[PDB]
Amino acid sequence: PVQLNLLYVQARDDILNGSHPVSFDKACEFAGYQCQIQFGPHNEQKHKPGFLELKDFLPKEYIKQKGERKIFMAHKNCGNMSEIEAKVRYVKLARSLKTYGVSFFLVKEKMKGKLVPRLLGITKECVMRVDEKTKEVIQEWSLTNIKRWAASPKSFTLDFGDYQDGYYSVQTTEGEQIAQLIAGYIDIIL
């Protein structure tokens, strides 16, 4: 099971550190599985409230949310699932998510009313805006939709040509990093 363990660990780490943004509801599904993997089947006589160090089973934005009740429910819900079954399920859940395999940056946008954070994610196929809190995918642009791109030290910008009206502009210090990624994905196609 070497490669399955390598997969699970990658996917678990990326979720646990925010590399792979997941909704709170999904954070607890993942944790539920992690509980099964690390403690076996749930046993009320042994898994008492307060015993779960949330820093080790949840992304940090969600520790404040007092979701131990939610985690123990998902942990109970696993029944007598084997460790390896839980790992296959953990990986399948991660991969079932639009956000899987997506490099993200946390950036601030402007709206029609104060600058709001937003997760900007890049892959080889597209570029997406994703809700920084709910993680719902709110806009998806194919890479062939990008006329041109530009990076400041304190900004990143996309020009979509005839596909959207008005440039997409964004406060970020990683602007040169976002664009480096995009250029590399362009280079492979040609």
Binding site: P1, V2, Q3, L4, L7, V88, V91, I188
Partner: peptide, 15 residues
């Protein structure tokens, strides 16, 4: 080289 597009990977490798 041949694994740049339809590169499917095997979760049972060295299981």
């Amino acid at each position: 080289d041949p694994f740049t597009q339809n590169g499917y990977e095997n979760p049972t490798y060295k299981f």
